[model samples]
Target: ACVHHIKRRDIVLKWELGEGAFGKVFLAECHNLLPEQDKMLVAVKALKEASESARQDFQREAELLTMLQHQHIVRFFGVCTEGRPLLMVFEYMRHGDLNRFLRSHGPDAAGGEDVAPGPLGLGQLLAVASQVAAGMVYLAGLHFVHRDLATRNCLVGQGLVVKIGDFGMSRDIYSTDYYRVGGRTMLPIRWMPPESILYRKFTTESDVWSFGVVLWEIFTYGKQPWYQLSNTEAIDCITQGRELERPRACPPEVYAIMRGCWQREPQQRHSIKDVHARLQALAQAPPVYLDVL
Candidate 1:
């Protein structure tokens, strides 16, 4: 068995975590996995729509996760396919998605659950980003194209640790963030590069473009990308050559890297491995990371 099939009756849905392309992801309690009076906290993605192609997508993601093991990737345990709504179980992240995490931890940051004592410093933000970069590098090595790459797709673990997590069905719930007007694929227009928007081309390079947008979100402490622009307006703006601006207190080095990620030509953009190296360097203490610059 390449992957374990969880039992249908042994699962308890805690609450809705988020919606995905075809179903809802819930914070759940699994009773059968662990031996000791098992009550394991996990994120369970349920395939609610249950169409043929969508079912294949759900199973494909589970099988893909079964083979992908990386520290910066949210751990995928197994799935439950014996019933109507198939379930993919994943490791639970305490802080939830990065966008929400950054929002609650900004300079005026407040709200609750393990929020940093103060505004997250550059070092902390970069530390969070570097982990994502490392994860993307792993994906690049695997030749895996993460069509969805954004702050919302990344999960925050303990404190500054982050992991790459993807899947989106929050379209109706988070309508403004996703656009499906083209009638085929739902596009996160704000995060797409020109080629992605016009040609529906998806590649690791497009993923890098999304990474740049994520960096902007990190530095802005989770402000919406192209906040004043709608999907069509954003498409117009991007097609006309505008890109994200430098964020508050964003170091020039970081801004430079962001620009590198936005290169109009995919082949000309900074590689995830190169970006990972730069982020790791920038994440170090000033004495060392500075001298090298």
Candidate 2:
């Protein structure tokens, strides 16, 4: 749509890079004037060509992302609303998302046998995690709730600069009393806290709970959670106050942060600001290369 009216002739659809439950990620190039002025590369997250609800969600997400501007958050270039197919343009991270790198290369690849591996030694993980926590701190300070905080949403740029992406499930933290009759059901079960599930409410503490799950996801390099248990059983276990053990590979300090994030009472969970400080302390310590994951 908007692209059709703009100088879209110079924009070329490159290829389909990946797909997720929501939709597909496409690689594209937007050529501009002058050889000295480099062309722009962008990742277009197109909503799935399925379900009306999916489309609306996509639109809502795009609207949200476009409104948010921060160094730690992904930069939203623009949106195409004029054509039949609507899409959002974003600055492309050369190294792609954290999940793709860790999963495809293996957790050890970060500092092991694989080529182009991750810098996954304990020091590296702490460094990256601290950076992520800094981003999360900024997010929380702004009263923004990043509902999804998994590795899959962490994008790495040149020099391994980490930036948060995928704001589809995020919401404003400072919004006034709002009550919506049930439409969407089930929180992101794996990441949600017991109180969030039982009480149907979300707060900064609940967000911290989700962050703990994300820490586990990162340390385990994307291992499936409750793989041996059914979804219903997993929820039941969590609701009953059962906590999963930290992955074997995670460092003790990392586990400490994770534990703090999992506090049952929303008021008790460590704030992202505190988490960032704790992680920074870990970063200054000697690199521990223990293979716990």
Question: Each candidate's lDDT (Cα)?
Answer: 0.83, 0.68
Per-residue alpha-carbon lDDT of candidate 2 for residues 127-222, written as tens digits (9 for 90 to 100): 667777877887788788876576766787766677888524222220111122356333456677888778877776777887787777767766
Alpha carbon lDDT at 174, candidate 2: 9
Residue by residue across 8-61, what tens digits does model 1's lDDT show? 887889899776456788988888677774778888888778888878787777
* TM-scores for candidates 1 onward, in order: 0.88, 0.78
Candidate 2 structure, TM-score to reference: 0.78
Query: Can you list the residue pairs that collide in candidate 1?
Result: 20-169
Top candidate by TM-score: 1
Tell me the spans in candidate 2 whose CA falls farther than 4 Å from its real position. Answer: 1-7, 20-23, 32-37, 47-60, 105-119, 167-186, 284-293
Error of 1 at 265 (Å): 1.9
Error of 2 at 14 (Å): 0.7
Give the backbone clash total of model 1. 1
